[PDB]
Amino acid sequence: FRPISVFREANEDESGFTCCAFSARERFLMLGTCTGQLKLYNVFSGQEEASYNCHNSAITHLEPSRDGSLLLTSATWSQPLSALWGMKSVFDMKHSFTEDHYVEFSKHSQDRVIGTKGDIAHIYDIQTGNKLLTLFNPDLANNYKRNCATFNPTDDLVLNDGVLWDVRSAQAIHKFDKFNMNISGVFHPNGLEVIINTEIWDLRTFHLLHTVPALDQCRVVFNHTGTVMYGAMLQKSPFGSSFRTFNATDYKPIATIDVKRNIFDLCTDTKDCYLAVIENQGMDTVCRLYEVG
Numbered sequence: 001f002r003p004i005s006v007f008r009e010a011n012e013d014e015s016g017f018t019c020c021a022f023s024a025r026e027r028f029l030m031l032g033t034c035t036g037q038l039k040l041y042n043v044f045s046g047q048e049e050a051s052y053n054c055h056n057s058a059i060t061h062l063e064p065s066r067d068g069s070l071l072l073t074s075a076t077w078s079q080p081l082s083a084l085w086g087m088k089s090v091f092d093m094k095h096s097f098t099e100d101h102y103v104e105f106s107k108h109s110q111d112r113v114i115g116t117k118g119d120i121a122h123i124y125d126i127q128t129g130n131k132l133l134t135l136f137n138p139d140l141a142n143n144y145k146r147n148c149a150t151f152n153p154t155d156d157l158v159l160n161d162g163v164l165w166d167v168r169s170a171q172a173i174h175k176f177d178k179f180n181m182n183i184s185g186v187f188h189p190n191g192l193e194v195i196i197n198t199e200i201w202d203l204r205t206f207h208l209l210h211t212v213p214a215l216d217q218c219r220v221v222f223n224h225t226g227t228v229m230y231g232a233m234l235q236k237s238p239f240g241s242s243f244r245t246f247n248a249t250d251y252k253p254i255a256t257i258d259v260k261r262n263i264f265d266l267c268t269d270t271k272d273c274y275l276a277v278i279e280n281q282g283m284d285t286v287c288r289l290y291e292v293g
């Protein structure tokens with residue numbers, strides 16, 4: 001990871017970036033701020049191109065749709081906690097998800113949003129904003145403190161609070177047992193495994209496949225080919241001063257990257273040529289751009 005350059009907030013003594021995503025066509029870097037702004041930076045020039053008032057509290061997380069038309073945001077306090085923005089011609093709010101502190105798009109066909117409110121998952125239609133499903137089974141709850149509900153790659157399944165759901169029947173098919181207080185887990189992009197903190201479970205048989213100690217208290221994101229996994233341990237900054245890369249096929253670590261600055265977020269471009277990391281220089285949180293490669 002070869003550092004290239006830094007994006008900082010123009011017209012501020014201290015930078016206040018909290019999260020990052022590349023635009024679908026990688027023209028711009030979208031940066032959320034601690035004041036609820038979404039700032040667009042030209043990747044080539046480093047220049048701030050727009051600053052949009054999205055929330056009345058710090059933005060925590062962003063997700064652009066693959067087709068470039070939509071953006072999800074989540075914030076910290078107050079209402080709405082999450083929202084869907086149109087990215088075509090005029091930047092505007094399409095819908096709000098008032099109660100949900102985290103939101104993701106569906107994966108295969110991006111026609112749905114999944115939101116999380118504590119132990120509960122909400123699925124919404126993108127066009128209508130209507131709530132299609134509520135997924136919560138009190139007999140299977142793990143009550144994970146940092147629960148984040150997610151679709152699998154085919155959108156047939158959801159993981160919510162370590163419970164596997166069949167979306168089509170809206171029935172719980174399996175509870176993965178609780179071995180940590182915080183992390184609820186994700187689907188591997190390979191479609192075969194679920195990664196819940198340090199445990200790698202077989203999605204089909206539910207048997208334990210691997211123990212991966214380095215993943216304890218980590219959030220993860222994959223490169224776009226699903227060959228490399230990035231993990232950063234939750235701790236103020238959401239993360240510590242390091243992230244680790246892993247071989248996605250065998251969960252063996254590749255590199256340990258200590259930036260010696262607390263991390264707020266990281267993202268890669270669709271081509272995985274670039275890595276952007278929000279790093280505290282101080283709060284003075286800048287976006288450092290790296291060559292991957």
Ligand SMILES: NC(=O)C[C@H](NC(=O)c1c[nH]nc1-c1ccc(Cl)cc1F)c1ccc(F)c(Cl)c1
Pocket residue numbers: 018019020060061062102146147148219220221230231232238239243244263264265266267
């Ligand atoms: N943009 C992404 O998805 C990437 C992801 N970033 C977050 O999860 C992230 C950023 N701020 N806060 C959070 C956060 C923290 C806890 C939870 Cl429960 C849910 C969250 F969204 C991530 C993954 C691996 C990493 F190495 C790093 Cl540094 C970041």
